[PDB]
Every structure is written in C-alpha cells, then in structure tokens.
Scaffold this active site. Structure first.
Site, PDB file in Angstrom:
ATOM      1  CB  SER A 258       0.668  -7.178   2.363  1.00 47.88           C
ATOM      2  OG  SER A 258       0.181  -5.984   2.936  1.00 47.88           O
TER       3      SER A 258
ATOM      4  NE  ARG B 239      -5.649  -2.226   8.615  1.00 48.94           N
ATOM      5  CZ  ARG B 239      -4.698  -1.933   7.696  1.00 48.94           C
ATOM      6  NH1 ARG B 239      -4.876  -1.085   6.692  1.00 48.94           N
ATOM      7  NH2 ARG B 239      -3.522  -2.537   7.784  1.00 48.94           N
TER       8      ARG B 239
ATOM      9  CD  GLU C 239       0.202 -15.908   6.351  1.00 47.70           C
ATOM     10  OE1 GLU C 239       0.918 -16.262   5.391  1.00 47.70           O
ATOM     11  OE2 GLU C 239       0.392 -14.832   6.961  1.00 47.70           O
TER      12      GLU C 239
ATOM     13  CB  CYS D  57       5.504 -10.883   6.601  1.00 42.14           C
ATOM     14  SG  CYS D  57       5.210  -9.331   5.689  1.00 42.14           S
TER      15      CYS D  57
ATOM     16  CG  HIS E 283       1.210 -12.131   4.646  1.00 42.41           C
ATOM     17  ND1 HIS E 283       1.314 -12.618   5.930  1.00 42.41           N
ATOM     18  CD2 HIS E 283       1.623 -10.846   4.677  1.00 42.41           C
ATOM     19  CE1 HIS E 283       1.748 -11.657   6.728  1.00 42.41           C
ATOM     20  NE2 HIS E 283       1.947 -10.556   5.975  1.00 42.41           N
TER      21      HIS E 283
ATOM     22  CE  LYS F 246       1.678  -2.601   3.267  1.00 44.63           C
ATOM     23  NZ  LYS F 246       0.338  -3.182   3.500  1.00 44.63           N
TER      24      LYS F 246
END
Lengths: 283, 292
Positions: A179, A236, A224, A129, A222, A150
């Site tokens: 992300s 969030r 993982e 990332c 990502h 984003k």
C-alpha cells in the site's frame, strides 16, 4: 541452533546451506527493541508489530518512541529519554508520506536525528514502507521516487538467495501486501546501495533487502497487516471521494462486501522471526 | 515473548488471540538451559532424514542438544548407526524436552509383522514419563494411534503421494501459529487418517485437515503428544526420488500430485511446502518442547 557430534554428516551439510551448527567439541539476555511509530493508527500498528515480535522464546523488552495524546503521553518516550541507551533492535514504521516531499514532512529533522543515532546505538534497524524511502534518502542520498498510481493489494514475490538468513524458511514464491505511492525499483536500489536484494515483486520492485553487516534491513510492503487493514484503507478512500481501485488479489471475487483473508500471514511470521533470530539477537 | 507497559492495549488484545505477553509489573526471563531432543529414526535413508529434521530444529535461538536413537541392532549404514546412534537402554534413565518419532516404510505391513513392534511400544510407554512433548510423523502416527488409543491400522486403497491443499481449524492455536488459512504440505503414505474418526476415538485437538478430510496436524491439550501425517521436512527432490525408485521397482506409480512443473518428471521440483514446515517445527520447539 542444534548441538550434534562433530563428525555427523549434518555438520558440513547444513553449514553448506548457511545453517549455524554447534558440535559436542566446541548467554541468554532480554533484547531491547525500540519502535518508532509514525503510522496514523497507533494502537492497530502497535498490535500488528507486537503480535509478530511476541512469537519467540526470546524476551523482547519493547519501548515505544514518538517523533513528537493521552495514549502517547502514557506509553511513549521522547528521543532525549533514550538517546543515551543502546538497543538490539529498532523498527521505523511506514507513514502516510508517499505524496509529501522530504522538506514538507514536519518532523524530517527528528527522523534524520534518529537514523544518525541508530548508526552507533542500534544493532539492527528494520525500515518498513515509507521509512524505506526516508532511509534511502538519509543513509544513501537516493531522491524520493513516486509511482504514477498507488500499489494497493496482495502481490506475488520471489526470493533471490536460497540460503539467506532473512528469508530462511520462505517459499521460492510468496504473497505480501503493498500500500504505497513510493517506487522501489530493485536494480536501481542495488546500484546505488550495494545492499543485498533478498526478495522482489514480479514487476521488479525490491520487497526485502539488507546490509551484509545486518545493521539495516528494509521491507517495502506491510506483512504485519491484519486481514481487514487494506479493506479499511479502501472504504476510507471511497468515503473521501478518491474513487479508489479495489486492492488487487485481496477481496474474494474482487467484491468489497466479501471478507478478505490474511493470505500473506505465513511470510510475515517468517520475516519477523528471522529478523529477531538472525539480526536483532544474532546466532 | 514481549514485555510491554501493564495498560498498553496490546496486553488484553493479544491475550484474547492466545498470545503470551509479559508486563513491566509481571515478567520472567527466557529459561537458559539447553533443550534435550531425541530422534527415533525409522526411515530407510538415515542421513537424508537426519539432515531434513536437523535443518528445521537448527532454525531457532534455543540450543537443542540432539541424541539419535536406533530401535534395533539388525543390519543399513551399519558404521554410521554405531558411531552416532544410542540404544534405548543408553537413555532409559534420562528425561528429554522432545522426542521425534519419524515415519517408516510400514504402511502395507500389519503391526504383527513389524520386526521391532515391541521396541516401538517400549519407547512410547517410556515417553509418557520421560518426554515433555513427542511428535509422531507419518507412519509413527499410525503406530501411536494403535499403541496409545487402540485404533486399528487403517489403509487407503491407493498411496497418497504429492503436495496437497490443507486448511487450519483453529485461528489462535499455538502449533499452527502464523499458518495461512490454506497451505501446502506433502504426503507419501498408504496409512488412512480420517479426521472425524480420530477426533471421536482420541479427543485430540484437530489443528489442520486436507481438503478430503484427512487429519494433517493434531495434538493433546496437555502438549505431551503431537501428530503430523505428511512430510513437511522433505527436500524439493525427496518425492521425485521415491517416484523414480517406484518406477524402477516396476510399481508403475502415478506422478506425485501437484509436484513436478507441468506434471513432467524431467522438470525440477520446488519445495512448495517449505514455509509451513518451518512454521510447524518453530511452533513445536517454541510452544511444545520449550513451552512459552
């Protein structure tokens, strides 16, 4: 790798597909893997990477590196503690630095130090990332590139090299989560680096790429992540009053009350197994 | 497996998802000895079948010493079998880490009428004491369900031919480790494999099913036997070559399901099941043959 009779058709056939084959005619050691954890959620990040690295018969001795509290004091070493050691592998995680200029990143000097050190001390380093943005700057002089909006969701990718080691086993097209504010145009990265582009999003971002010498490898999503990781970022961002878009292709029927599945699990497992087997260990 | 500090949260957290984790205080190395894997090849296309299984077994840091076993003398690439295959009597007195028993073109053949049925029973009886883990593929599952569990031959009214949707049943299982909750795998079989019935008759763990309730993957808790009812080892073109052979034989078959782009047999098929065939054989080698 298999060991078969010298003249078995599989020998020449599998060698043509870039598969190493031993024949009846012609050592095991623990691997040392360092993880430089720059992610805000240190424990979740440890659990995600260590799950993928544990899925192997190879013994992987893990050292956790802080760039620079009880958890870090107990389990993490500083750079000076390991600066005289060699590692088979290094993972540099992402970090929430999409919107931060290099000169405003508090520990920019410490990151430069680790990456310059990796050149002589680490067989293969994997950049994840934001760590890709950082490594493209420090290793290749590419300026920080930032998207307008984003990228947040589970995206369609395709492989470019049917016989490549890092994408061994991958489907011709597959899901992986993103992300990031960081922009990673593949054609531009190829021009400025001569790295091999191994997978792309349908929109032309580089997802996976690496050096032919296998010393460096880059993943811009990502894979993982747990099923719920993007959901937590979303809620969030909501409670912070950022008013985020629902992550793309993530929540059943795009409803944030529904339970997301890890639709990208398979190619995360293939990526890390391939990285350990062909880049860290080297068949 | 990883080695981490004793109190790191990952130790208890990964152990709770059925992941083996070593620590500073308690760890052992990778076992250094090469693995011994035997392949009983019953498929008509001997070389294509070798290439498909050997591709998947080579994708591992473990050294895998391969022996190829023929079941019969009956003639066939006769010279290829003579040069590269051993007979049962040649390996009778040896132990293996793994045995693969391939599929065979016997879906419509009663057990009585299978020329080499006695040699099949012989090998399966021998595997109990001589092989750590045996994987049965396609028709070999039907053979093993009869010989190990007395289950009679079950036959579909139409051939299952194509690339199908499956789901895993056990999120933390070893053999399905890394699998997506939903995934593709190919089938080419007359054999019927109802999951609920097989679970009743065997007490095996059902690890993946098709959406119509066939067992796809299942295994014994002791890891001695595992079963795959489809062909995740198949190349992109394998089902196309079966289809063209069947049309030529005048069986006038249906197109394999969800296989050819636009369902047009002039279009180039992709191996849309590659990923979970790799995960399966990596998991079988790591957790069943080798045993972390």
């Amino acid at each position: 790798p298999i060991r078969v009779p010298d003249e078995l058709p599989a020998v020449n056939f599998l060698r043509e597909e870039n598969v190493f084959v031993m024949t009846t005619s012609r050592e095991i050691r623990p691997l040392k893997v360092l993880i430089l954890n720059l992610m805000p959620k240190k424990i979740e990040t440890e659990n995600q990477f260590l799950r993928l690295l544990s899925n192997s018969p190879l013994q992987v001795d893990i050292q956790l590196l802080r760039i620079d509290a009880e958890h870090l004091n107990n389990f993490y070493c500083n750079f000076e503690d390991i600066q005289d050691q060699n590692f088979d592998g290094l993972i540099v995680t992402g970090a929430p630095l999409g919107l931060v200029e290099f000169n405003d990143v508090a520990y920019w000097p410490q990151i430069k130090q680790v990456l310059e050190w990796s050149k002589d001390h680490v067989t293969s380093t994997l950049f994840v990332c934001w760590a890709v943005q950082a490594a493209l700057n420090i290793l290749y002089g590419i300026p920080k590139q930032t998207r307008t909006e984003k990228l947040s969701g589970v995206y369609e990718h395709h492989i470019l090299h049917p016989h490549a080691l890092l994408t061994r086993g991958f489907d011709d097209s597959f899901l992986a989560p993103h992300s990031r504010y960081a922009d990673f145009p593949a054609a531009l990265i190829r021009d400025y680096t001569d790295l091999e582009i191994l997978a792309e999003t349908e929109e032309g971002d580089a997802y996976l790429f690496a050096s032919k010498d296998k010393r460096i490898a880059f993943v811009t999503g990502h894979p993982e992540y747990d099923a719920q990781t993007l959901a937590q970022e979303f809620f969030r961002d909501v409670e912070a009053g950022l008013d985020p878009d629902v992550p793309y292709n993530y929540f059943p029927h795009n409803d944030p009350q529904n339970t997301p599945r890890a639709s990208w699990r398979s190619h995360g497992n293939l990526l890390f197994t391939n990285w350990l087997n062909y880049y860290v260990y080297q068949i």
